[PDB]
Amino acid sequence: ANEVLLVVGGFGSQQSPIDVVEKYDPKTQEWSFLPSITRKRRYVASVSLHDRIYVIGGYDGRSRLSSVECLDYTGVWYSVAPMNVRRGLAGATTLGDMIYVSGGFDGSRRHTSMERYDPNIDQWSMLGDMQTAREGAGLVVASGVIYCLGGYDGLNILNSVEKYDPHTGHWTNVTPMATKRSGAGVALLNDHIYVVGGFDGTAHLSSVEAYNIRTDSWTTVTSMTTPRCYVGATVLRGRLYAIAGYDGNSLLSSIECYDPIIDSWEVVTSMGTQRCDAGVCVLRE
């Protein structure tokens, strides 16, 4: 019944992409290492699904990537089928028993497209396009529907939000966020979508907003302890964790935790690898 945090890859203090994989357990507050990924990837995404960690896309310093590798967490990494497109700073989520990845950047273009991974046939299928091309936007599932949030189209940091209805296969617009953010963290918690930090085009942000789904409205939440952009976000037993990132001067090694009980953020660790644009996901143990 006990979940843990996972952090893969990203951009490290030696200002290169890394291959470090870390586990963080919030109950003991201990860190540990898992086996490294095969290649070093910054700008990278990660999801877990049925006790399998997938590492998706990213950028190694020479090329952006379509490759994807896998680890049965119950440890050696192995390659599975590649995406149709090379994607860094892509959004990524799971729904049903599928992976969905959307947006990103191949080295020339930002993508509107979303593709989907089926572990039963080891194949990535392309789906319908978003209206806006987005890098640095997160994907989050709520009640069987996918939301893409904020990001960057090549010219503008975005406050726009789109939702994908699997019953229709179409994207539609939702009410936008109050502030434009790229590199923000996004997670679902108690039927609200939280967006934490990111970069609005001038300032690195500590600000947090929450989308009430039942009302189609956004509200300001308590700012984090420190600005963070290109930051991971995940929910673990009813609490929202902000993970590493860039504060606009330095790479963060700390995770902070938002407890709705106190409506407040607490640093729970100062000890991970400093890094940003890494992938994060939750593991059942």
Binding site: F11, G136, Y230, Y246
Partner: peptide
């Protein structure tokens, strides 16, 4: 360089 990133 994505917006708001560190120097490289």
């Amino acid at each position: 360089g994505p917006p708001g990133g560190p120097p490289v």
